From a paper:
The [name]/[name] family of RNA binding proteins mediate sRNA-directed gene regulation throughout gram-negative bacteria. The [name]/RocR system regulates competence, a specialized physiological state involving the coordinated expression of multiple genes which allows the bacteria to uptake environmental DNA and integrate it into its chromosome (i.e., natural transformation). [name] binds and stabilizes RocR, which in turn binds and represses a series of mRNA targets that encode components of the DNA uptake system.
We carried out further truncations to define a minimal RNA-binding region of [name] that would be amenable to structural studies. Limited proteolysis suggested RocC24-126 is a stable folded core, however, this construct was defective in interacting with RocRSL3 and could not replace [name] in an in vivo assay to measure DNA uptake efficiency. In contrast, RocC14-126 displayed a similar binding affinity to RocC1-126 and is perfectly functional in vivo, indicating that residues 14–23 contain critical residues for its interaction with RocR. Deletion of the N-terminal 13 residues, which are disordered in our structures, did not impact RNA-binding affinity or transformation repression. However further deletion to residue 24 resulted in a ~threefold reduction in binding affinity, similar to what we had observed by EMSA, and a total loss of transformation repression.
Author numbering: 19 to 125
Write the structure that this text describes.
């Protein structure tokens, strides 16, 4: 389909291929700590459509600095893997770190 004037082709690829993690059309959920390495195992298929390992890292940084991502990192919320499986909880220190980032972004 049409592609927009400013976009992340890497994040579009991630949302198409791992919607449980990167499709936020309805909701957004905390991601497994270290999900970047899980993503990098799929780098070959991304490279076939011109998506580089660096751009995949860039896309994950973009996603996880969204205010809506930072706001979903509340203590005891469930972290999911690339396929939506629960793996861990957001800790109190992780929650605190996210609330400080939000407060600084919104000040």
């Amino acid at each position: 389909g049409p592609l927009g004037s400013a976009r992340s082709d890497a994040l579009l690829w991630l949302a198409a291929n791992f919607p449980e993690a990167f499709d936020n059309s309805l909701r957004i959920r905390p991601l497994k700590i270290g999900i970047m390495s899980d993503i990098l195992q799929h780098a070959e298929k991304a490279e076939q459509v011109g998506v580089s390992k660096s751009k995949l890292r860039e896309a994950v940084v973009l996603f996880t600095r969204r205010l809506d991502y930072l706001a979903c990192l509340k203590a005891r919320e469930v972290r999911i893997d690339l396929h939506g499986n629960p793996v861990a909880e957001v800790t109190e220190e992780e929650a605190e770190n996210a609330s400080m980032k939000i407060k600084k972004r919104v000040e």
